[PDB]
């Protein structure tokens, strides 16, 4: 603590006073991982490996929950043409949990395949499938041209070019109504200013990459609107109480201790917030319980020392630190110099029962100085001498002796 004073002040000498070198830290030991255990596997191969797919105007929605997935086919082993992600990192797919999954499978040409993204406008982008600006997910593409294509063209997959107004996102258009740009009624058939909006793709294997179809499955991720769907796949550890450790609970992190909860709980609730707007409580995924979270590493380290022209003895002060449980130094932790004050415990000063005039203040009425083979002592600040005179009505004191005193006051201008 002599060397910690010179680091913050950027001086090679130490002046006379009380300084704050650093703050009290608690290093975490283990990491509690509590993840749910499901014996079911997630059928991702139904939507990925199927022969027949839907079109861009009406797709097949899929909700997958209450299983255990494998994300290594999206990331680790990837024999795919183009894989992209936006909000969630592809490295971090094994970590996070989300609200629900929407698997949207459609077959799209290679010229129009770049319009699946937030903030796009085009033929396929406007009137079929839109994404909002806050949308989170990944785009997986693979070249399908050696399988479902045809030499004379594929008329099975269809798309819709024409619509009157802009379509709301996450909505399928089943309407067969003829687009009417004129004042003449179309009556369901072609005519003047009457076009049939539903057309067929140009797909052939023999031409370039604009005519090659791609298999695009877009996953929808929404964050913190609900508890966990599948889980992030990992291992699982035990549940440690009354010890400061790192937390990872369904992707949400934290540092603190786990204590019992006397407050009532909500059965639909994963976690909640205190008056400090941080997570004070969490629910176990496997069984339904609630435990309180109190954070760690609180308080500060202050030093009390005379200057370098006097001695090297440095007294250290913890403020707001519980001293029953106890910086890189272990050397003063043997004890027996510890005196308990209001602000904390003072290590390195011997408490005396006398009352003197001190120099370096601490607080709460208890001060400290350097007095006499000499050491730092701590005591209570003196009020001065005590004067006791008996008084009556018939006595007076008139001074018979005078002196002239000269005092000096300094005011900066």
């Amino acid at each position, epitope marked *: 603590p002599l060397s910690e004073t010179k680091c913050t002040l950027k001086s090679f000498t130490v002046e006379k006073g009380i300084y704050q070198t650093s703050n009290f830290r608690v290093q975490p*030991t*283990e990491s509690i991982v509590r993840f749910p255990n499901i014996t079911n596997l997630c059928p991702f191969d139904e939507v990925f490996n199927a022969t027949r797919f839907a079109s861009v105007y009406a797709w097949n929605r899929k909700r997958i929950s209450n299983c255990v997935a494998d994300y290594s086919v999206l990331y680790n082993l990837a024999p795919f043409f183009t894989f992209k992600c936006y909000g969630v990192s592809p490295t971090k797919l094994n970590d996070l949990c989300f609200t629900n999954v929407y698997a949207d499978s459609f077959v799209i040409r290679g010229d129009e395949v770049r319009q699946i993204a937030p903030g796009q406008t085009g033929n396929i982008a406007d009137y079929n499938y839109k994404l909002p600006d806050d949308f989170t997910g990944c785009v997986i593409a693979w070249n399908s041209n050696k399988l479902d294509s045809k030499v004379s063209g594929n008329y099975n997959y269809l798309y819709r070019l024409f619509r009157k107004s802009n379509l709301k996102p996450f909505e399928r258009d089943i309407s067969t109504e003829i687009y009417q740009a004129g004042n003449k009624p179309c009556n369901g058939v072609a005519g003047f200013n009457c076009y049939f909006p539903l057309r067929s793709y140009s797909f052939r294997p023999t031409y370039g990459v604009g005519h090659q179809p791609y298999r695009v499955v877009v996953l929808s991720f929404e964050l913190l609107h609900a508890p966990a769907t599948v889980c992030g796949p990992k291992k699982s*550890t*035990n*549940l*440690v*109480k*009354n*010890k400061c450790v790192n937390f990872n609970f369904n992707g949400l992190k934290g540092t603190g201790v786990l204590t*019992e*909860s*006397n407050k*009532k*709980f909500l059965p639909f609730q994963q976690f909640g917030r205190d008056i400090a707007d941080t997570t004070d409580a969490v629910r*176990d995924p496997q*069984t339904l*319980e*609630i*435990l309180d979270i109190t954070p760690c590493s609180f308080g500060g380290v202050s030093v009390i020392t005379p200057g370098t022209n006097t001695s090297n003895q440095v007294a250290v002060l913890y403020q707001g630190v519980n001293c029953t449980e106890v910086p890189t130094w272990r050397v003063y932790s043997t004890g027996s110099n510890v005196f308990q004050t209001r602000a904390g415990c003072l290590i390195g000063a011997e408490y005396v029962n006398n009352s003197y005039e001190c120099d370096i203040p601490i607080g709460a009425g208890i001060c400290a100085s350097y007095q006499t083979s000499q050491s730092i002592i701590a005591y209570t600040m003196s009020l001065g001498a005590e004067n006791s005179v008996a008084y009556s009505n018939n006595s007076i004191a008139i001074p018979t002796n005078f002196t002239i005193s000269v005092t000096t006051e300094i005011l900066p201008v």
Partner: antibody, heavy 120, light 112 residues
């Protein structure tokens, strides 16, 4: 199979040091905490101390302060308990247990038992 | 802390009856809707064994004649039907507050 092993008997003089052994097998030693209990005949069970083996931090009873010293060995996966200056009332039957966690923490398994006789 | 005291010290129950042995608590062990209590049964020459956790539940491998109930500071361990292998000392334990304490204990006898 998880089984905790202890020696049967240990002879120690009063005023000397007491060293005991609890061998852990079948589980990770730094993952699960260890507990030491004390059983005198006719009195029942009394609780000595509990130690986190990874941090080497001890939790002791108020009456049992400075009599017992808890230390661990993570290389051999063997927990130790060091008693200082035993008396005639300190001779008892000692167990060690594995503390498993599911909300309220139970004691899943137990050791073979150790009878410590203090005499010269 | 929480001091557990069981009454009486010894109880002799004949075969076929119901044994009522209570573990009384000085403070409330109920928090989060679930109380913190365990039950131990110690045969002589052997370490004690775990029976009932959280009270409302029963450990697998323990037979169905060992049951318990109660809420708050008043718990009740009901032993029925009484068999000759059930004579042993009964204990109760709270893990809630540090430092943990142990109960006084109650030994069950067979009246023949």
């Amino acid at each position: 199979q998880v089984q905790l092993q202890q020696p049967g008997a240990e002879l120690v003089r009063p005023g000397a040091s007491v060293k005991l052994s609890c061998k852990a097998s079948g589980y990770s030693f730094t993952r699960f905490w260890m507990n030491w209990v004390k059983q005198r005949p006719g009195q029942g069970l009394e609780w000595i101390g509990m130690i986190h083996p990874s941090d080497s931090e001890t939790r002791l009873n108020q009456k049992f302060k400075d009599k017992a010293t808890l230390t661990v060995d993570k290389s051999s996966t063997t927990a130790y308990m060091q008693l200082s200056s035993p008396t005639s009332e300190d001779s008892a039957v000692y167990y060690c247990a594995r503390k498993d966690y599911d909300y309220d923490a139970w004691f899943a398994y137990w050791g073979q038992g150790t009878l410590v006789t203090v005499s010269a | 802390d929480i001091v557990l005291t069981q009454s009486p010290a010894s109880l002799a129950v004949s075969l076929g009856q119901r044994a009522t042995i209570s573990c009384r608590a000085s403070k409330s062990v109920s928090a989060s809707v679930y109380s913190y209590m365990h039950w131990y049964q110690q045969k002589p020459g052997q370490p004690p064994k775990l029976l009932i956790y959280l009270a409302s539940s029963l450990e697998s491998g323990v037979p169905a004649r060992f049951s318990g109930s109660g809420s708050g500071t008043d718990f009740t361990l009901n032993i029925h039907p009484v068999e000759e292998e059930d004579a042993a000392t009964y204990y109760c334990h709270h893990s809630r507050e540090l430092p943990p304490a142990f109960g006084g204990g109650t030994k069950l006898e067979i009246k023949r």
